[PDB]
Amino acid sequence: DFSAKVIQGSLDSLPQEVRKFVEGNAQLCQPEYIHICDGSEEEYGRLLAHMQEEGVIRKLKKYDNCWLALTDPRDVARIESKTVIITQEQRDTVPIPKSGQSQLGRWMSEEDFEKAFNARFPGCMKGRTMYVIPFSMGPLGSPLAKIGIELTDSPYVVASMRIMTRMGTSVLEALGDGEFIKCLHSVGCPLPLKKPLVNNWACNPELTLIAHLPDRREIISFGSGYGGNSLLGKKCFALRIASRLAKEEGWLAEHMLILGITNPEGKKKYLAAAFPSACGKTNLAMMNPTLPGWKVECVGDDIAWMKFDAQGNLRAINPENGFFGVAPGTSVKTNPNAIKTIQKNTIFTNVAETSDGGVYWEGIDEPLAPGVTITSWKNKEWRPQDEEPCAHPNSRFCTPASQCPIIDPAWESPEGVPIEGIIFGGRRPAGVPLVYEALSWQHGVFVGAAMRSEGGGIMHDPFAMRPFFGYNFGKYLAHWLSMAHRPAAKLPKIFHVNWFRKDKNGKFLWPGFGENSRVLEWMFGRIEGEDSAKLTPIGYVPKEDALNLKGLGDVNVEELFGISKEFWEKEVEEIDKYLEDQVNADLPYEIERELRALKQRISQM
Numbered sequence: 001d002f003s004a005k006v007i008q009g010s011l012d013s014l015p016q017e018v019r020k021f022v023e024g025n026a027q028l029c030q031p032e033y034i035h036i037c038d039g040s041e042e043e044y045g046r047l048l049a050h051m052q053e054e055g056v057i058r059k060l061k062k063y064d065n066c067w068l069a070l071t072d073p074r075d076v077a078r079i080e081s082k083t084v085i086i087t088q089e090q091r092d093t094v095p096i097p098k099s100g101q102s103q104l105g106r107w108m109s110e111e112d113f114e115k116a117f118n119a120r121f122p123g124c125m126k127g128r129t130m131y132v133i134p135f136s137m138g139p140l141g142s143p144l145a146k147i148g149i150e151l152t153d154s155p156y157v158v159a160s161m162r163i164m165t166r167m168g169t170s171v172l173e174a175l176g177d178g179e180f181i182k183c184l185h186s187v188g189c190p191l192p193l194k195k196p197l198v199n200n201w202a203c204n205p206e207l208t209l210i211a212h213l214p215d216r217r218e219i220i221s222f223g224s225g226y227g228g229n230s231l232l233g234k235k236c237f238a239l240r241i242a243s244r245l246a247k248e249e250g251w252l253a254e255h256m257l258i259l260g261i262t263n264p265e266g267k268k269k270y271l272a273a274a275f276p277s278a279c280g281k282t283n284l285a286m287m288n289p290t291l292p293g294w295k296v297e298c299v300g301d302d303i304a305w306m307k308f309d310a311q312g313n314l315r316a317i318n319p320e321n322g323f324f325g326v327a328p329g330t331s332v333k334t335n336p337n338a339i340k341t342i343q344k345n346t347i348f349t350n351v352a353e354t355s356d357g358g359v360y361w362e363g364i365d366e367p368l369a370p371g372v373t374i375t376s377w378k379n380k381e382w383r384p385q386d387e388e389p390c391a392h393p394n395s396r397f398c399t400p401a402s403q404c405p406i407i408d409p410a411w412e413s414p415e416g417v418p419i420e421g422i423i424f425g426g427r428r429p430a431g432v433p434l435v436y437e438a439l440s441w442q443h444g445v446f447v448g449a450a451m452r453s454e455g456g457g458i459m460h461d462p463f464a465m466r467p468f469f470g471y472n473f474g475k476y477l478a479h480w481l482s483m484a485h486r487p488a489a490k491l492p493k494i495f496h497v498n499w500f501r502k503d504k505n506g507k508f509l510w511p512g513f514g515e516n517s518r519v520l521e522w523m524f525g526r527i528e529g530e531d532s533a534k535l536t537p538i539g540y541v542p543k544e545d546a547l548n549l550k551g552l553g554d555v556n557v558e559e560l561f562g563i564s565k566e567f568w569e570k571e572v573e574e575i576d577k578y579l580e581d582q583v584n585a586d587l588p589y590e591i592e593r594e595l596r597a598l599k600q601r602i603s604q605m
């Protein structure tokens, strides 16, 4: 009985299964205190002041209630190589690659995991508070929501989870005796410290391990206090566990922004889009459209949970409550809506601080007044001449979603928004035109599966889900393809975009950002069934003169929309080899058929 150690809440008022979870882990981890989070303002404010008291965070004096955490430089990112999924059979988690190295997941056996777990968690919270975070992924009480309980020894996790999910007493009330996902986290530095603390940032890099056990509905994460490793909604629950539930239950859990776009006629449609990190989800979800009379509103910028309703509409929710955005490259010029969102009640991690207590980072494109100086994320004086960036490249803002000036009115509607188009895209400097439309659902799924993006080399990132599949990618393709056999299903039109095509000198061919409204306008019209497409071997592209290019006189249209037989032969052979090596016996017939159909179309150029 751990009652004597509860410093907020009551073990007696927790649902029986929740209590079991907490007490079992209190006995294992040996926390000094147990704090059952209520999610209140008062709780939050004091937690912040305490972290400030301890030097774990700094208040940024230039803003209303903004904070800065600077990490141990060993703990700056989600770490794929220490991220695993446990299942009885390896093939259920990942396909077996012919090369002996899967790019599509990282399986761990139950046996190896039990040894790892036992080498880490016993006594790991000694002399710390175990916080109990009851959270909802999705609007509270939504039929599409799922509930988690995170145990953590990190107040930084609590504060960030209050932003990134819906947490507190109301969730425990909603939960009752329902099922929930068990989320267990420790920074893995029990007191007294065995190793020196760096930058007031508790972590255990050598023992970092982020595990998922979908068959037990557990997420178990050790040694990192950072982002996707420690905020267990966000990638572990909302993509990895959730994609497996989705497969079981007949829905989709995806790495997609969700936006609502209204045309000048006042007609509105929702679109979802899957792009990998650094390929523009935040920019698109919060776009300030350049086209007069168009409006974009943000439902979410990262995760979409989608389920066909009784009427066959594909209904999407954003299961998050906030934006955990990469800060560098965010500028007033490029992304004014994100700039407005983050000016209050935001936690920043590993950005630079100006001497007047403000935030700074690469690509902020805000000149500073003469005399204003910069402290880098490594707590050193820094000047724009310097070899190193002032902010870590993976540094973040963590901001409440409700503060986005263009947040959609239906962003928390419990039944979700009806999705009429799904967009795929990444960074392709060559070959791939600005926009194309898939010929069918099956072709659209192949376009998803074929996605590549230049991020530290050109690499495959199918559906923008490479680091996030909860189970075998081949089976995930079959799941997508199965949506076509749902009677009365209204399947979204699928498009592929490329904002990032360059000429031989390395110059972007398309201005992008707000100008992408011109491409959305074409998509909108296409969903309306307008005759604005020309057929090409890779799918439909805009007709000559179909795009509104008024205001953009010097756009190399020939190169931006060019399709080269030579490029596309190479592209299909590379896709064929990748699918063969990485997916093989688990590749659905229809994906193989689409690949052969594409090859044939190109052969006839």
Ligand SMILES: Nc1nc2c(ncn2[C@@H]2O[C@H](COP(=O)(O)OP(=O)(O)O)[C@@H](O)[C@H]2O)c(=O)[nH]1
Residues within 6 Å of the ligand: 275, 276, 277, 278, 279, 280, 281, 282, 283, 284, 301, 325, 326, 328, 329, 330, 334, 363, 499, 500, 508, 511, 512, 513, 516
């Ligand atoms: N050239 C160009 N860059 C873009 C565009 N959209 C976003 N970016 C840049 O890509 C980087 C990451 O963008 P962001 O929207 O944060 O991407 P996310 O990581 O997918 O959410 C930033 O430097 C952006 O300024 C675009 O349409 N064109």
Ligand SMILES: [Mn+2]
Residues within 6 Å of the ligand: 255, 277, 302
């Ligand atoms: Mn993401």
Ligand SMILES: [Mn+2]
Residues within 6 Å of the ligand: 281, 282, 301, 302, 324, 325, 326
């Ligand atoms: Mn983002």
Ligand code: NA
Residues within 6 Å of the ligand: 055, 056, 057, 069, 070, 071, 072, 199, 200, 201
């Ligand atoms: Na710090």
